[PDB]
A = this chain, B = another copy of it.
Amino acid sequence: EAVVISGRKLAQQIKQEVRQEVEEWVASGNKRPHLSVILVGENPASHSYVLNKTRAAAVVGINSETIMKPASISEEELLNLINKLNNDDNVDGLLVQLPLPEHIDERRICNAVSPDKDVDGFHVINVGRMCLDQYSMLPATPWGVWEIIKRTGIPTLGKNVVVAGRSKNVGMPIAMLLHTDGAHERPGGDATVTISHRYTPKEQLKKHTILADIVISAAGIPNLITADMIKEGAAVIDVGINRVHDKPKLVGDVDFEGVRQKAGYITPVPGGVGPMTVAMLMKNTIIAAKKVLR
């Protein structure tokens, strides 16, 4: 059957690296790295997610704090907090949990965060830089995905890859990473990439997946990817994080049970990509702390 890849395990490794790198940075007598998180309102998943990131920083020896605010808050307000933090030399990374309330403009918030602290890599300059294959604060989930692939020894160069979904902070950067030149400042995957989305016809999607050596799903649609869609031996990465009921639980976009018996590798949900996301956040924070980039 399919090698199942543990994102839980892989992420724990990665955090171990980070722990050490931070240990080193402090023992050379640099300041201990500080991550600030802003959380607005009360989405319960959102809470869970900050909790995750607060733990991770604890584990790897990074100082954390979560500044909570009521959904009641205004855009101008939020910008002032963000402005406080950009100037607090104690804060190395600054991250704004999403989504924000509809009366706050996400893009403007994202570009408020100083790019040098932008551990989410959602600032316009980081996006620009990533799209031009330059060094940048890479976004965590796409970077996670790439780490899964690169650490499992799965090749990409020359290979056919489909990414379903095209969100600006997951699908598009994944596709950007995977298709680009291995030779540029920020190496990419040199794969041949297909972007699918909410207006791909299921038959046309399937027609592309069937040719795919790697299928990467970030649609947020259960049972989107079924074993009849997948070539034999293929690697299947599940970025989906879908909340259904059967008691209330969580699934990917892959038919795990089906696909597992056709695929050469697969990631579980839970315990695949989610934790890899939190791991790369820790990577970006140490990087931010070392003032490496701009």
Interface residues of A (CB under 8 A from B): 107, 124-129, 131-134, 157-158, 160, 166, 168, 172, 175-176, 179-181, 190-197, 199-201, 204-205, 207-208, 211
Q: Across the interface, which residues of B come within 8 angstroms of A172, CB to CB?
A: 131
Given known contacts A160-B204, A197-B192, A208-B194, A124 and B133 CB-to-CB distance under 8 angstroms? no
In the bound complex, do residue B166 and residue A195 qualify as a contact, i.e. CB atoms below 8 Å apart? no
Shortest 10 CB-CB contacts between residues of A and residues of B: A128-B128, A124-B128, A194-B194, A179-B195, A127-B128, A190-B199, A131-B131, A192-B200, A158-B199, A193-B195
Residues of B within 8 A of A126 (CB): 128
- Whole-angstrom distance between the Cβ of A80 and the nearest chain B Cβ: 23
Distance, CA A195 to CA B127, complexed state (A): 19
Q: What would be 10 A-B contacts, judged by CB atoms less than 8 Å apart?
A: A124-B125, A126-B128, A131-B131, A131-B172, A132-B168, A166-B180, A175-B195, A192-B197, A192-B199, A192-B208
Complex contact B128–A131 (CB within 8 A): yes
How far does the Cβ of A14 sit from chain B's closest Cβ, in whole Å? 27
Chain B residues within 8 Å of A190, by CB? 197, 199
The verdict on A192 contacting B192 (CB below 8 Å), with A128-B124, A128-B128, A132-B107 known, is: no
Query: Whole-angstrom distance between the alpha carbons of A168 and B125 in the complex?
Result: 15
Q: How far is A131 from B158 in the complex, measured between Cα atoms in Å?
A: 24
Copies held by the complex:
2
CA distance in complex: A207, B107 (Å): 38
Q: What residues on B are CB-neighbors of A193 within 8 Å?
A: 194-195
A129–B124 contact, CB under 8 A?
Answer: yes
A211: chain B residues within 8 A (beta carbon): 204, 207-208
Q: For A175, what are the chain B residues with a Cβ–Cβ distance below 8 Å?
A: 195
Contacts of A201 in B (CB 8 A): 158
CB distance from A122 to the nearest CB of B (A): 9
CB atoms of B158 and A134 under 8 A apart: no
A166 to B134, CA, bound (A): 15
Given A127-B128, A131-B131, A190-B197, 15 more contacts at CB 8 Å? A107-B134, A124-B128, A128-B128, A128-B129, A157-B199, A158-B201, A158-B204, A160-B208, A166-B181, A179-B195, A179-B197, A192-B195, A192-B196, A193-B194, A208-B211
Output the least CB separation between A31 and chain B (Å): 29
Q: How far is the CB of A42 from chain B (nearest CB, A)?
A: 27
Q: When A194-B208, A208-B192 are in contact, do A127 and B134 touch as well, CB less than 8 Å?
A: no
Give A180 to B196 CA distance when docked, in angstroms.
10
Task: Return A196 CB to nearest CB of chain B, in Å.
Answer: 5
